[model samples]
Target chain A: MYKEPFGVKVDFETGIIEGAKKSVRRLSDMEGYFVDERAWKELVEKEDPVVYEVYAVEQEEKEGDLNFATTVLYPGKVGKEFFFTKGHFHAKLDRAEVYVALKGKGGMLLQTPEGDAKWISMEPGTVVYVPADWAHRTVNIGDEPFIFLAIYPADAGHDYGTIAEKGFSKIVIEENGEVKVVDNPRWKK
Target chain B: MYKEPFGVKVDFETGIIEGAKKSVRRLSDMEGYFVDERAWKELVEKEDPVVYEVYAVEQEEKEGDLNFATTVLYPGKVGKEFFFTKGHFHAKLDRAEVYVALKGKGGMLLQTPEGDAKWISMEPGTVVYVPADWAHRTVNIGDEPFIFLAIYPADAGHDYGTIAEKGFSKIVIEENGEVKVVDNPRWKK
Candidate 1:
C-alpha cells in the first residue's frame, strides 16, 4: 500500500511537534536506567519530573517506510551521571538510526553487546549516525533541554529489554566541567 | 562488517557539512527533468550553474541501516517552473524516506506511476515523509535556498530513469506571485 506524504514541523525549543502524534515518559518511567538507583528513587519521591518526551509522527506499517520522532530530554543529574533515555537495540538488530541535534548540548553513547563503546557530543545541527547493531542512548550532559530528531527505517523495531538487561557498556557523567564516559560497572557480559 | 557511529555537523545555511562526502549537480545533469526543455537548454548555455548539492554521510552495505544526506537546492527557474531536483523511485521499491526541510520556501511533488499526485509545502523544521513507491521531486517555489535532509534505509535503491522517462504526474509553476501544480502537458503515460 502506498502511504501518502505527511509533513511534521519540529519546534525544537518547545516539545511541540506541529503534528498531533506524540508519546511522553516521566522520570518514573525510566526506572532502571540510572546507575545511582538511590538518587533516582529519592528524586522520584521529591519531584518526579517529566524527564524526556518524544513528539512522533504516526506511521502505517509499510515495508520500507521510515519513522520520525524528536526527543526533548530535559537535563538534571542523579548523583554523578547525567539524565539519559532508556536506549534500545533494534528488534531488527541490523537497522540503524540517524539523529539530528536540533537543540541542546548533550552526548550519545553507542555500545554493542561485545563491549565496544563510542561516544559523540551533540549540539544544534549535529547529525549523529547510529550504526547497525549499536544500542544507543542520549544523555543531557548540559543543564538545558536536549532536543533532537530521530529518523529510522519502518521496521527498525525497538528492544529496550536487552539493554535494560545488560545495560550500556559505557556511561556518561560530568567530570570537573567536561563530560566523561567510562565502563558501566553493572553491565553484564 | 560492523559500521561505527559517526557524527557529522550540518551547516545548513552554508551547505558545508562537517563531513567529507558530497556530490554536486549542475543544470546540465538534470537534462530531461524540466517540462520546459528548450528553456533548460538556454539556462545551460549561459550558465551551467550548480543547481544543487548534497552532503551525504557514507554508509556501508548493511541490510537495515539507514543512510543520511542534506541537500541545498538553489532557487531559480527554467521558464515558468521553479528549479527542482531529479526525482527518483526507490531501487528497492518499498523503501520510504523522511526528509526534514532544514531551510526552505519550497514544495515537494510526490507522484506514483499510477498518476496519483501529492504535493507538500516545506519550511525549516518540516519533516516530509515520502512513502514507499512514490517518486518525489522538490521545487524551490520561493526565491530562497531550499535545504532539506533525507534519511532512508540502506537498500532503498534509487531508480531515476523511470521518473525521468514517464515524468512526475504534475509540474509546479509560478502563477502570478503564487505557486501552483498543474498537469505536465509533457507527461507520457
Candidate 2:
C-alpha cells in the first residue's frame, strides 16, 4: 500500500495539474463518437485537435482509498456538438463519484441502461454528485476549456466499454445560438 | 441505495454550498483545542464567533460510496494560534481522504500515532491527499476564511476521540508575524 501523503499543486485558470499522470485524447482517438460525419472528417483532415486530457494522481488502488483527478476538456466541436469525454460507468456499477467544476462552462450527461437521462450544467463553483450506476460524460459548452476535478473510489474501476458499446441517451450541442440537450438518435436506449 | 442523481450549486467566493446540510461550529464548540487558555477565555467572553462551518451532501453511507463536503474555517486567533479544525483519523483507520482548497490560505496538519508528521500548505487549486492512518486537521493561517472541499469514503467514520485524548504532534501558530509549525508539548508522542 502507498503511504506517502503529498499536496498536489494545480492551476485553475490553465487547467494544469503539476506532477500528475496525464492521458491525452486527440481527435484520432474518437472514432465514431461524433454526430456529424462531415465535421469529423473535416477536422481530421485539417488537424488532429485534442478532445480532453485527464490528469490523475497515482495512489493506492484499494477499497477505501480514493482516486482524485482533474479533467480538462478543450472547447471545440465536431459538427455542432462540443468536445466531450468518452463516457463510462464504474466497472463496480454501484460506485458513486463527485465532480467539482473549477473553471469554464460545461455539463455532465448522465444515464443508465434503463434509459433514465439527465443533463446538469457545470461551471465554476458547481459541485455535482453523480449517483450510483450512472454512466457520465463531460461536455465543454463554452469557448474555453472546461476544467473540473473528479473524486471517486480508488477501486471504482472505469467501464468505458459499456459506454463505447452504447452511446448516451442525450447529446449536448449548440442549437442555433443556444446550448441544448437533445435526444441521441443512435443511442441504444 | 440513493438512486437520484443531482447537481449541487455552490458559490466559491462566499463558501456557499446550496442544498447541503449545514453544521455550524461556534467558538463555544471548540472546548479545549487551542493552546492559549487566556485568549480562549477572552474570546468566549466576547461575541461567540463562528470557528467553522461544514456543508455536507447527504448521500449513500456505505462502502464504495463516497462522502463529499465543504469546510469553511473562519480566520481568527486565540493568542498566537490561528483557528483550526478538531483533527481526527478515520475510524476505519486505513481510509484515506482528499482535500481540495477552493479559496483562501490554509494548511493541513497531518500526523500519525507513530510520530510521522507533515504540513502541507493549501491555497486555491491545491489538492492535498491524507494518506491512510494519518490524523489530519485544517489550520486557517490567512486573513480570510479558509475554504476547502474534502472527499472520503462514506463508510470511513470519523474518530475524534483519539485526537481529543492526544493532540497532534504539531501545532500551527503565528510566531514573529509568520506562520510556523511548532511541537505540541502535550502531544502523546
Prediction 2 TM-score vs. true: 0.96
* lDDT for A22 (candidate 2): 93
Proportion of native contacts found in each model? 0.94, 0.88
Q: Model 2's CAPRI class?
A: medium
Q: What is the TM-score of chain A in candidate 1?
A: 0.93
Tell me how candidate 2 scores on lDDT. Answer: 0.86
- DockQ of every predicted complex: 0.81, 0.77
Each candidate's clash count: 2, 0
Tens-digit lDDT string for candidate 2 (B16-131): 78878999998788778887878888898897789999998855568777778889999998888889999898888878889999899999998886866899999988999887
TM-score of every model versus the real structure: 0.94, 0.96
Residue A81 alpha-carbon offset, candidate 2, angstroms: 1.8
Candidate 1: which docking quality band?
high
Superposed model 1: Cα runs more than 4 Å off: none
Instruction: Pick the TM-score winner.
Output: 2
Provide C-alpha RMSD values for all models, in order: 1.8, 1.7
Q: Kindly give the stretch of ten consecutive residues in candidate 1 chain B with the minimal lDDT sum.
A: B57-66
In model 2, the clashing pairs are none
Q: In candidate 1, residue A185 scores what lDDT?
A: 81
Which candidate leads the pack in lDDT?
2
